[PDB]
Design a protein around this ligand. Structure first.
Ligand code: SF4
Ligand code: SF4
Ligand code: SF4
Ligand code: FES
Ligand code: FES
Ligand code: CA
Lengths: 156, 148, 905
């Protein structure tokens, strides 16, 4: 049971205006649906395939190819902590252990209430201020494991 | 820039029309490759393409398409304003220009500094990064990101 | 171009890549992702060869032989240590996550991955960690899905999307978690999904119909045959085991059906393995049912035939040329009746007249893929002649191929071909009563009744050449569309016009002929293509005879007291009540057929004929190419009680016993010589295949592979004494492995593809002069007629505009791929695939009747108030009712007929 709203459809069409192919707005269409609904459900793939005219298999391949186009339900906030080499030298494992101790889950799982979804991510492009962590729209640098509980209370 | 006559139709009155867009990616490492960047720009999966044909002839939507890094496009206006022989007279090295170098990872002052080519890697570690931190020794280094 | 492999100088074609350049010469390079028809993508990285640019070069470079052009002066090494080690490493990397599933796999002994694992000499496993697994999707009744066996070679997505045009199969996933399938579970709705069981190198996509009653490849007894499910006549390899037809495989014909079949011809074989089929001759005395063998049945039939004043024969477009000729010579030239109706025979005669008299070269199916602009008038190709639709898709993508070739891109760089040609494609203009499956690539689709489609064709023909008869009364919007089609067709270089007898009208064929003549008059290499209904419609039209109405009125008037019905159900071309009355009126009905037809209750004698798997014969496809189909097995080997013979053999023995009171079982060569003697215009069927005396260095051709198993135990349940193997006196093949099946033998009829080290369907590479091109020593089957020196005139009888009469409803034919064939709908696997019978209505006419979708509307045609649920068709024109042809109780003869008393009930 899915139906695109007015704002999502108008934004999708405006993204089709930017290119010479309606296929090229598929990634931004999926990002619009992810922004509105938290993730991309099953009917959204067919709705985007209907508005763009491309096959639904293409939309499914694009949606499942990219990591930050979520195809499964997430919590209220998605924590994306960096696990790459520079933050490993800076010790991201302490922050991962702190988040595992606080949220009492594993990387990739969601809490029973649906508050935080903990996920590793690639390099955040801020390696000089490592280690970093990207919550939904905010990046955090110079992290310490003791500041994790104080950091997680700013997202109810 | 579009408001003040620098982007759009009839830029400055020369007769050149240029439209600039921002395509925000969906977070895949392989999207940085030029042919895979072209593939992801067209809304497909970011699989790279065979070369030849190179993107300069048949690139984005089969059209001539040139893919450049941000730092190259930031280097070009200094060349176009201050001249060519001035750009060739920055450092006495075969690779002309200035590169944004810097050391990172358990150093005293990690950061980003614009240095000419030919500066030794010890100078970036010592004069700018300050060397290793308190109680640390140096074992190895890697010049050009993770793929080096 | 000249290349050097290991110091050997080879002359190659310089426009080709190195992989099939070496594969043409017989040089073995392992490969997964490359296909001769799809192209090269450089995915599997298995085709590595070490390239040198100088004659004195030590290092070289490991280059992809499917991605490197075979230019003049390349020194490549295949058996070098570095290249062999890298190929073994690639095989090992593909073998890291592969499951331990080979015994329980449907492609064991038919696996490409097995051949390339043994070819590289990799047998030691040092990988010790876990293997990734995947779930499976329910892809429908045809395709069994097992994703664990995949190697991510991207052939399925490439074929299904860039070749077949399908939209439901795609590539999803991640780095190593790559998935290949649908976004959900459900049936693969493409009409060419069946070729995935041979495109896929591994056992991911497998034949579920074969997987039901499964046997290995070496257990199969193969034969070369021609697919009987429609008029295209794609060459197939039926393979049987234990007395039942097991699997229809693709057979390489470089001119017709090179690498791809369709699903109706690949999965529609289930009617052969029905237990309701007559296997012995059965005679009726009143209500008593007795079984005879051949001799007493022949003698009794000859006695009753002698005790009648006139014996008439009703043939069929489903039966072969020899069987119809045997019926014609049994009943006389003037008393032979074609089983089709008057309208179908009129359309068939017109199509044959345009083909062999119109002066326009009709192309073969391989030649269709090179034509520029395609105009389809009336014919719904994708549901009747689906392979022509696939070739139409190829001819449409030919424009992007042309722009790619103009930019100095080689033809095997398929990724660059779709890269340059983003959405630009050749013009395709299809006309039908509703939306087609070719609408995704068609430049225009005209949804109109057959009169308006014919008038559109006449308008195109007049606007090309002003000497053509003009039609007056066209709206200016349709006139602008006419002008667009005219500008597209006149500016092309190889226009193609596709029509057929499935449109249900004669003026559509006349308009298509006029368009082809107008294109020919402007100096263009124009081709035409008529798609017939049944497999041997063209041969029956060439031979000729009366219509079914004349035979029925001879039976009803009393002048025919004996009728022989050869392989006809008689309800497909006439009403059931009239046929039942004319058969109960006749005092002798003799039905010679291999299927339990509905008229066998009225039959005084039932003769168990043989189907395509158990009979030899010749069939004429829709382009006039005579093709010989051979026997797969003797039905009497396992069930010794079974008296099941060829229909031409039945009729010839009956003719001999009627004349000289002796039973003479003839040979196929004698009947072939009789056809080419009595009928000058069927003389080409002698050259369709060589006679039974043809030998390859003294020995025959094997129907089963050299490692056929269980000879001394497959019949040990009946008797421990293994009998003599059956002898094939009709053809050059034998029911044994004591025969020749080498890839270098001087023959054209290949039962199956096998080479040492090549067990997959990719073993067809050894049977061709060049890989992907024609078959070695020529393709089988010859054209019956050539192009005439001069052509027909302009067909002047234009039709009128469709005005919907009140009360009467014109029946619009809605052909389906699964259900419109007489024999394919009898297959039990098609009952879970065919759609429900819906009558299709305009929204305006449904609102006028007050009926909504889902409710039942009853319609009466000749005293049959049959109810059907309603589907709404927006594209259907007002005043028509959409009916599916070939279904239960709805004959294809209903096309164009009226329909009174259409009320909600
Ligand atoms: S696909 Fe081939 S290698 Fe894989 S399990 Fe089946 S037979 Fe074995
Ligand atoms: S499913 Fe088969 S055809 Fe598709 S990528 Fe995997 S091995 Fe290749
Ligand atoms: S297109 Fe016709 S002849 Fe060819 S495989 Fe399909 S049903 Fe058989
Ligand atoms: S390595 Fe973590 S921000 Fe770059
Ligand atoms: S056959 Fe060349 S890389 Fe696959
Ligand atoms: Ca025989």
């Amino acid at each position: 049971a899915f139906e695109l709203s007015a704002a999502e459809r108008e934004a999708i069409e405006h993204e089709m205006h930017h290119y010479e192919d309606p296929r090229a707005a598929s990634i931004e269409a999926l990002k619009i649906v992810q922004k509105q609904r938290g993730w991309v459900p099953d009917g959204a793939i067919h709705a985007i395939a209907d508005v763009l005219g491309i096959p639904a298999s293409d939309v499914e391949g694009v949606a499942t190819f990219y990591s930050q186009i979520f195809r499964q339900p997430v919590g209220r906030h998605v924590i994306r902590y960096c696990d790459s080499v520079v933050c490993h030298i800076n010790g991201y494992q302490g922050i991962q252990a702190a988040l595992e101790k606080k949220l009492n889950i594993k990387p990739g799982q969601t809490t029973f209430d649906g508050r935080f979804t903990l996920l590793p991510t690639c390099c955040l492009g801020n390696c000089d201020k490592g280690p970093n962590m990207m919550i939904d729209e905010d990046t955090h640098a110079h992290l310490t494991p003791e500041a994790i509980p104080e950091l997680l209370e700013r997202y109810k | 820039a579009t408001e003040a006559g620098l982007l759009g139709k009839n830029i400055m009155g020369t007769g050149f029309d240029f439209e600039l867009f921002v395509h925000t990616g969906a977070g895949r490492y392989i999207c940085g490759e030029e042919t895979a960047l072209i593939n992801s720009l067209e809304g497909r999966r970011a699989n790279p393409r065979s070369k030849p044909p190179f993107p300069a002839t048949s690139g984005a939507w089969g059209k001539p398409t040139c893919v450049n890094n941000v730092e190259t496009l930031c280097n070009v206006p200094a060349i176009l304003a201050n001249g060519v022989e001035w750009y060739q007279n920055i450092s006495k090295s075969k690779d002309a220009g200035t590169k944004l170098m810097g050391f990172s990872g358990r150093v005293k002052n990690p950061g980003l500094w614009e240095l000419p080519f030919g500066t030794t890697a010890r100078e970036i570690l010592e004069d700018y990064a300050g060397g290793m931190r308190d109680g640390l020794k140096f074992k190895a280094w890697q010049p050009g990101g993770a793929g080096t | 171009a000249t290349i050097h492999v290991d110091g050997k100088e080879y002359e190659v074609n310089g426009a080709d890549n190195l992989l099939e350049a070496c594969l043409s010469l017989g040089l073995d390079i392992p490969y997964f992702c490359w296909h001769p028809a799809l192209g090269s993508v450089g995915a599997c990285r298995q085709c590595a060869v070490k390239q040198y640019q100088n004659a004195e070069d030590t290092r070289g470079r490991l280059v992809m032989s499917c991605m490197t052009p075979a230019s003049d002066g390349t020194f490549i090494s295949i058996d070098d240590e570095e290249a062999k080690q890298f190929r073994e490493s690639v095989v090992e990397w593909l073998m890291t996550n592969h499951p331990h599933d080979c015994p329980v796999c449907e492609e064991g002994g038919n696996c490409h991955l097995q051949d390339m694992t043994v070819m590289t000499g990799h047998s030691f496993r040092r990988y010790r960690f876990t293997k990734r697994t995947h779930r499976n999707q329910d892809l429908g009744p045809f395709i069994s899905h097992e994703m664990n066996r995949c190697i991510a070679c991207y052939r399925c997505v490439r074929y299904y999307k860039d070749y077949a045009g399908g939209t439901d199969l795609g590539v999803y996933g991640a780095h190593d978690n790559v998935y290949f399938g649908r976004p959900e579970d459900g049936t693969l709705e493409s009409e060419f999904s069946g070729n995935l069981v041979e495109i896929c190198p591994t056992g991911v996509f497998t034949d579920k119909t074969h997987s039901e009653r499964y046997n290995r490849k070496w257990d199969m007894q193969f034969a070369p045959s021609i697919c009987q499910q429609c008029s295209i006549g794609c060459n197939i390899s039926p393979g049987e085991r234990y007395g039942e037809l097991r699997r229809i495989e693709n057979r390489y014909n470089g001119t017709v059906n090179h690498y791809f079949l369709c699903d109706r011809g690949r999965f529609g074989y289930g009617y052969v393995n029905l237990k309701d089929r007559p296997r012995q001759p059965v005679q009726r005395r009143g209500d008593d049912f007795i079984t005879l063998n051949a001799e007493q049945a022949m003698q009794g039939a000859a006695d009753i035939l002698r005790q009648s004043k006139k014996v008439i024969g009703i043939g069929s477009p489903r039966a072969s040329v020899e069987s119809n000729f045997a019926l014609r010579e049994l009943v006389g030239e003037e008393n032979f009746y074609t089983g089709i109706a008057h309208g179908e025979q009129e359309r068939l005669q017109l199509a044959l007249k345009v083909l062999r008299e119109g002066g326009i070269y009709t192309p073969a199916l391989r030649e269709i893929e090179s034509y520029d602009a395609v105009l389809v008038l009336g014919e719904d190709v994708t549901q009747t002649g689906a392979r022509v639709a696939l070739a139409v898709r190829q001819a449409v993508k030919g424009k992007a191929r042309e722009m790619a070739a103009a930019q100095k891109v080689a033809d095997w760089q398929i990724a660059a071909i779709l890269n340059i040609g983003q959405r630009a494609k050749h013009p395709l203009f299809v006309t039908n009563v509703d939306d087609t499956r070719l609408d995704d690539i068609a430049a225009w689709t005209y949804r109109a009744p057959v009169e308006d489609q014919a008038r559109l064709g006449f308008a195109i023909a007049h606007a090309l050449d002003n000497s053509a008869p003009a039609v007056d009364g066209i709206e200016p919007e349709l006139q602008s569309k006419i002008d667009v089609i005219v500008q597209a067709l006149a500016g092309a270089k190889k226009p193609l016009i596709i029509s057929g007898t499935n449109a249900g009208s004669l003026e559509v064929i006349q308009a298509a002929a006029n368009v082809a003549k107008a294109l020919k008059g402007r100096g263009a290499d124009v081709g035409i293509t008529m798609i017939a209904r049944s497999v041997n419609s063209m041969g029956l039209g060439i031979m000729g005879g009366g219509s079914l109405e004349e035979a029925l009125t001879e039976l009803e008037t009393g002048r025919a007291d004996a009728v022989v019905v050869l392989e006809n159900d008689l309800h497909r071309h006439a009403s059931a009540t009239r046929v039942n009355a004319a058969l109960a009126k006749a005092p002798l009905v003799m039905v010679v057929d291999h299927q339990r037809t509905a008229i066998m209750e009225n039959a005084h004698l039932v003769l168990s004929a043989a189907s395509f798997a158990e009979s030899d014969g010749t069939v004429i496809n829709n382009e006039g190419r005579a093709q010989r189909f051979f026997q797969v097995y003797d039905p009497a080997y396992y069930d010794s009680k079974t008296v099941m013979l060829e229909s031409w053999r039945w009729l010839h023995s009956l003719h001999s016993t009627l004349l000289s009171r002796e039973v003479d079982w003839t040979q196929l060569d004698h009947v072939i010589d009789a056809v080419v003697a009595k009928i000058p215009e069927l003389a080409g069927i002698k050259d369709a295949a060589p006679d039974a005396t043809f030998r390859i260095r003294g020995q025959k051709l094997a129907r089963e592979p050299h490692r056929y198993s269980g000879r001394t135990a497959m019949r040990a349940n009946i008797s421990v004494h293994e009998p003599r193997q059956p002898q094939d006196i009709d053809t050059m093949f034998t029911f044994s492995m004591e025969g020749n099946n080498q890839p270098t033998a001087h023959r054209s009829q290949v039962p199956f593809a096998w080479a040492p080290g090549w067990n997959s369907p990719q073993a067809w590479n050894k049977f061709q002069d060049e890989v992907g091109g024609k078959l070695r020593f020529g393709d089988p089957g010859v054209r019956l007629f050539e192009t005439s020196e001069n052509g027909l005139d302009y067909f002047t009888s234009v039709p009128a505009r469709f005005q919907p009469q009140d009360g009467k409803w014109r029946i619009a034919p809605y052909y389906h791929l699964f259900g419109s064939d007489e024999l394919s709908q009898r297959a039990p696997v098609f009952q879970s695939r065919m759609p429900q019978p819906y009558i299709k209505l305009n929204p305006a006419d449904a609102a006028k009747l007050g009926v909504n979708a889902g409710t039942r509307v009853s319609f009466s045609y000749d005293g049959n108030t049959v109810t059907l649920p309603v589907e709404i068709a927006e594209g259907l024109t007002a005043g028509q009712v959409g009916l599916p042809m070939g279904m239960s109780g709805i004959a294809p003869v209903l096309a164009g007929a009226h329909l009174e008393d259409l009320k909600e009930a």
